Amino acid sequence: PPNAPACMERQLEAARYRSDGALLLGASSLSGRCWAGSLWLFKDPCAAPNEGFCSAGVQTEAGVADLTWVGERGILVASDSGAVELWELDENETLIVSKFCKYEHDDIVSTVSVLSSGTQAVSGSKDICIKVWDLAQQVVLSSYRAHAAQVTCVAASPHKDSVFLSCSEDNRILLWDTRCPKPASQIGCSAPGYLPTSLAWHPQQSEVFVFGDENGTVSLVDTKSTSCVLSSAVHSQCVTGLVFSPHSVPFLASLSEDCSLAVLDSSLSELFRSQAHRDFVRDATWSPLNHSLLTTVGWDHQVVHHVVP
Amino acid sequence: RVSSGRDLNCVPEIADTLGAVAKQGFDFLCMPVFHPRFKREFIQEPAKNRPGPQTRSDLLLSGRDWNTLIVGKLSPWIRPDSKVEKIRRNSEAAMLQELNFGAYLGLPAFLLPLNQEDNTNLARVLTNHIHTGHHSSMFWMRVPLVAPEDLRDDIIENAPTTHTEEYSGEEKTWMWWHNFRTLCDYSKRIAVALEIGADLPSNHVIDRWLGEPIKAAILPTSIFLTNKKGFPVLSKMHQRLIFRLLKLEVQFIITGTNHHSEKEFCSYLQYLEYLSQNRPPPNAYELFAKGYEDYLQSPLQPLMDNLESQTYEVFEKDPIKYSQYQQAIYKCLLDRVPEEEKDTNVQVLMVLGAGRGPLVNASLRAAKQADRRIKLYAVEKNPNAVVTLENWQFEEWGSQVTVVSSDMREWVAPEKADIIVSELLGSFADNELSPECLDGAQHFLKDDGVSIPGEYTSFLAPISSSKLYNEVRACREKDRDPEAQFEMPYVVRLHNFHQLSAPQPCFTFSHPNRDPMIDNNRYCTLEFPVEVNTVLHGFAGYFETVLYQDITLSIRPETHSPGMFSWFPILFPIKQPITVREGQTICVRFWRCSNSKKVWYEWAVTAPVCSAIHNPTGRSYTIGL
Numbered sequence: 061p062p063n064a065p066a067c068m069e070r071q072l073e074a075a076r077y078r079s080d081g082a083l084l085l086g087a088s089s090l091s092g093r094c095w096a097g098s099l100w101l102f103k104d105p106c107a108a109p110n111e112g113f114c115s116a117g118v119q120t121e122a123g124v125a126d127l128t129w130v131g132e133r134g135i136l137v138a139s140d141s142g143a144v145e146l147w148e149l150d151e152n153e154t155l156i157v158s159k160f161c162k163y164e165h166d167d168i169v170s171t172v173s174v175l176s177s178g179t180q181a182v183s184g185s186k187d188i189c190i191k192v193w194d195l196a197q198q199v200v201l202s203s204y205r206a207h208a209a210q211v212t213c214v215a216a217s218p219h220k221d222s223v224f225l226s227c228s229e230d231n232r233i234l235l236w237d238t239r240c241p242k243p244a245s246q247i248g249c250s251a252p253g254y255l256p257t258s259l260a261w262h263p264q265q266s267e268v269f270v271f272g273d274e275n276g277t278v279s280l281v282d283t284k285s286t287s288c289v290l291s292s293a294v295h296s297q298c299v300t301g302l303v304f305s306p307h308s309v310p311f312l313a314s315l316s317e318d319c320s321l322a323v324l325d326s327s328l329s330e331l332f333r334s335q336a337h338r339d340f341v342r343d344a345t346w347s348p349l350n351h352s353l354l355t356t357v358g359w360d361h362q363v364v365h366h367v368v369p
Numbered sequence: 370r371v372s373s374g375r376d377l378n379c380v381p382e383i384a385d386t387l388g389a390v391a392k393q394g395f396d397f398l399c400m401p402v403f404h405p406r407f408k409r410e411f412i413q414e415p416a417k418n419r420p421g422p423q424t425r426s427d428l429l430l431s432g433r434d435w436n437t438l439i440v441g442k443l444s445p446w447i448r449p450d451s452k453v454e455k456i457r458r459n460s461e462a463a464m465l466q467e468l469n470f471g472a473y474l475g476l477p478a479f480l481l482p483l484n485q486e487d488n489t490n491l492a493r494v495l496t497n498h499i500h501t502g503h504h505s506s507m508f509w510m511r512v513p514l515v516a517p518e519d520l521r522d523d524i525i526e527n528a529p530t531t532h533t534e535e536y537s538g539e540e541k542t543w544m545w546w547h548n549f550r551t552l553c554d555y556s557k558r559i560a561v562a563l564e565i566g567a568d569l570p571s572n573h574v575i576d577r578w579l580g581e582p583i584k585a586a587i588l589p590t591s592i593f594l595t596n597k598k599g600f601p602v603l604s605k606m607h608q609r610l611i612f613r614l615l616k617l618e619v620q621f622i623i624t625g626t627n628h629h630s631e632k633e634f635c636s637y638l639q640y641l642e643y644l645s646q647n648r649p650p651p652n653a654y655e656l657f658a659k660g661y662e663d664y665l666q667s668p669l670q671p672l673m674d675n676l677e678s679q680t681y682e683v684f685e686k687d688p689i690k691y692s693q694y695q696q697a698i699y700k701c702l703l704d705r706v707p708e709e710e711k712d713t714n715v716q717v718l719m720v721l722g723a724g725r726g727p728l729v730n731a732s733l734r735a736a737k738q739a740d741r742r743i744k745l746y747a748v749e750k751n752p753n754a755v756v757t758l759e760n761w762q763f764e765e766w767g768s769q770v771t772v773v774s775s776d777m778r779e780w781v782a783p784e785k786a787d788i789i790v791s792e793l794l795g796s797f798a799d800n801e802l803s804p805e806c807l808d809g810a811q812h813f814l815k816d817d818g819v820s821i822p823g824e825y826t827s828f829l830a831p832i833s834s835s836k837l838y839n840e841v842r843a844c845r846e847k848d849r850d851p852e853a854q855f856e857m858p859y860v861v862r863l864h865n866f867h868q869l870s871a872p873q874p875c876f877t878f879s880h881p882n883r884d885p886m887i888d889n890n891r892y893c894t895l896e897f898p899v900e901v902n903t904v905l906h907g908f909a910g911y912f913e914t915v916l917y918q919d920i921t922l923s924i925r926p927e928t929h930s931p932g933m934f935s936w937f938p939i940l941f942p943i944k945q946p947i948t949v950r951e952g953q954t955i956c957v958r959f960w961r962c963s964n965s966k967k968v969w970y971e972w973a974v975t976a977p978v979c980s981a982i983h984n985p986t987g988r989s990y991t992i993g994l
């Protein structure tokens with residue numbers, strides 16, 4: 061396509077299926093002369109990661125730490141540059157153009173999530189700050205320096221537009237509610253634990269979530285009961301991502317630095333496992349069209365599709 | 370002008386980036402050597418066997434640039450002190466790797482973070498790296514004024530920021546550095562890059578960083594207030610710290626993105642330059658002491674050694690000492706000879722240790738100012754200076770001055786003296802043996818005779834300087850006691866230090882001394898109220914003297930004679946640095962000791978803890994008679 065680069069950077073960072081079927085790819089260059097990032101659109105999910113069989117493409121100034129789908133055409137990006145930027149899609153969907161680009165964080169913007177409404181988003185960064193964004197107006201409404209270390213992961217609640225989780229290397233997991241005068245609340249499963257790294261809400265119940273620590277232990281938490289209901293030693297390395305399947309009774313996809321994939325029960329028992337990756341597993345995304353189909357990206361530049369029993 | 374650089378944790382094109390920051394007016398760049406997000410695995414497959422390259426090539430810049438322009442940064446994911454073993458072992462390998470790459474490039478400095486209490490393993494690895502290979506790289510520890518935990522907005526509903534004050538608690542950031550530097554055994558290659566928060570903490574916790582080897586100060590863009598016309602500036606209390614830091618000649622480091630987007634980036638820099646431009650200009654003293662800051666020198670021994678020509682010349686350029694000496698004789702004349710006796714009475718003046726003879730000229734100027742008549746004797750032991758005196762004598766002074774080329778303790782005077790004039794004083798007053806020299810000379814002073822000076826007094830104060838402690842430590846020499854350097858005083862323009870208590874008097878001598886059994890040995894116990902948590906590294910010495918009546922000289926900071934650069938302070942180090950808590954008393958014990966051949970000092974600390982008695986029997990340091 062026009063403007064779409066001839067080549068894509070080796071380190072694939074994120075993979076997200078749009079609700080209609082398309083696949084969004086963010087990839088960074090983490091080695092070599094130029095340290096940059098690129099955004100890709102694949103209307104053929106099986107064509108990935110071939111730069112010649114893509115629908116759209118664009119280069120970004122710096123690498124891609126995290127991204128998210130905003131609606132159906134908008135792409136929200138957490139840039140190494142300390143900037144959060146929104147990328148607008150073409151009406152033809154062959155051109156990816158920049159909407160806004162705001163340098164508001166001081167260090168690398170490391171995590172981003174969109175709130176339920178889809179007009180507001182929340183970004184976490186290494187600068188320790190968390191910021192609430194007006195996407196339509198391209199400004200920061202609220203800035204929260206609540207943690208003591210770099211913010212690892214921020215995850216907006218599925219339905220409540222004012223609620224989100226956030227975890228950091230200061231061993232804090234914070235349940236947020238912008239409605240309160242003190243927005244943050246320290247939700248602790250245990251008083252001493254290995255540092256939280258990944259967060260995922262349950263898609264049905266807005267009162268339960270899961271969190272993976274740096275130790276390879278995925279734990280299931282209830283907000284009200286405030287105790288570790290259940291946990292399992294799923295991985296041998298830092299748990300880097302958690303994704304729930306769109307199923308009625310959903311499965312949990314599990315990412316790590318042991319290059320493996322895990323799909324888990326509601327009681328966190330192991331169903332599926334895949335070492336198809338030779339490098340770190342970076343993201344997971346469930347196919348909207350085929351629920352039993354799951355796509356994973358790595359740093360081994362491999363786009364793999366899994367069939368879940 | 371200011372030496373300052375740009376901190377970045379994102380570099381896409383190293384070529385463009387380094388140009389871009391240089392264009393902005395920055396002297397150097399703080400960047401990562403490997404990609405900050407590029408976590409590497411060293412132990413378990415398959416991640417272990419990740420195909421290279423592992424980072425960008427050294428060819429992208431000239432060696433010239435690597436040596437001058439680039440300061441490396443340890444990848445933020447490297448955590449040697451993790452609770453997780455796998456992360457610990459990987460960080461170790463990663464840290465060595467990154468530090469080695471830094472050294473391979475030949476970077477002048479490399480940044481490492483102190484952001485938690487425990488950095489034990491981080492220290493070991495660095496220490497091991499320091500003792501592997503031969504390199505001259507510096508290491509800057511990134512440590513903030515206030516811990517990030519003690520800065521957080523009080524917005525956690527069920528974990529409030531405890532509103533009560535804690536004196537020690539708010540100093541925890543220094544204790545991180547202290548533990549780290551101690552583990553590394555005070556390496557000269559480990560310094561501080563001090564991060565400054567938006568809210569400055571109490572004055573005491575800022576002050577503990579006195580004496581610390583601060584090489585850099587880090588300023589986040591966010592801490593800058595914006596003014597009436599959209600320009601980045603700083604508060605009054607932030608300015609204070611900057612001015613304090615400028616005197617300490619640190620490099621400045623700007624971190625974070627521009628938050629005043631409407632104006633260019635060099636705006637933060639412009640203001641810093643502006644602050645450096647406005648600094649209260651150097652006084653008469655500071656324009657002389659410029660290069661001598663924290664530079665250790667051996668004490669002079671003008672008895673057993675003859676002073677070099679240029680030594681005299683430099684110290685003869687003092688704008689105050691000789692002016693003060695001229696007046697001190699001028700008053701002594703008017704007192705000793707009444708107006709009706711101004712032609713019948715000629716006074717006999719004796720310059721003991723005349724040097725190149727500026728005190729002879731000062732004696733002559735004192736006469737033709739008080740309109741009185743004087744006979745002069747210019748006694749000098751240094752035969753090389755005597756050459757200058759006898760030349761001054763023949764060409765200018767004439768029969769009025771009678772030059773004597775001998776020691777004062779030895780000289781047999783033809784006649785007794787009205788007034789003896791001497792400048793035999795060191796930084797600690799009596800350390801150049803002025804007491805002993807005038808004692809063997811007061812026998813030829815008249816019973817009503819005046820000695821200038823009349824008296825002098827040494828002062829002492831406890832100091833904290835991790836910087837100066839390391840300077841002494843570095844003075845170990847072959848073929849002597851490996852700790853000898855700690856058992857001797859040093860003349861030094863003290864600079865990077867902290868005076869922990871008020872200077873108190875130590876030893877006093879009077880001249881003449883009509884005490885039946887004349888004795889110059891001493892023993893003095895001092896007690897110093899200290900009101901900060903600190904680490905004692907030694908004692909600073911000063912002196913005061915009374916030339917005549919109210920005409921006095923002082924190097925004591927409170928009463929310092931203005932513009933007088935003739936004396937720097939003395940430093941009496943101590944072998945082991947002693948921890949001093951807030952509200953404790955430092956008790957020090959000084960002894961002046963002598964035999965027939967040599968005089969020396971011995972010292973010890975008795976409280977809060979005991980040190981070893983220093984320089985016993987004058988084993989490490991003596992002043993010869």
Ligand SMILES: O=C(NC[C@H](O)CN1CCc2ccccc2C1)c1cc(NC2COC2)ncn1
Pocket residue numbers: 657658661666669676680681683684685724794795796801860934935936937938
């Ligand atoms: O404090 C120092 N030396 C201790 C001596 O007792 C000083 N006296 C001062 C008077 C004097 C007069 C004639 C010949 C020698 C001397 C030496 C010192 C200061 C310093 N000052 C720098 C020169 O300009 C500032 N440099 C290095 N040493």
Ligand SMILES: Nc1ncnc2c1ncn2[C@@H]1O[C@H](CSCC[C@H](N)C(=O)O)[C@@H](O)[C@H]1O
Pocket residue numbers: 671672676681684685721722723724725726727728748749750751754775776777778792793806
């Ligand atoms: N015991 C002694 N007998 C004679 N001269 C001495 C002495 N001890 C020190 N001196 C001399 O006294 C001088 C001290 S330095 C002062 C020099 C000069 N009056 C000036 O102010 O510039 C030295 O030149 C030294 O040689």
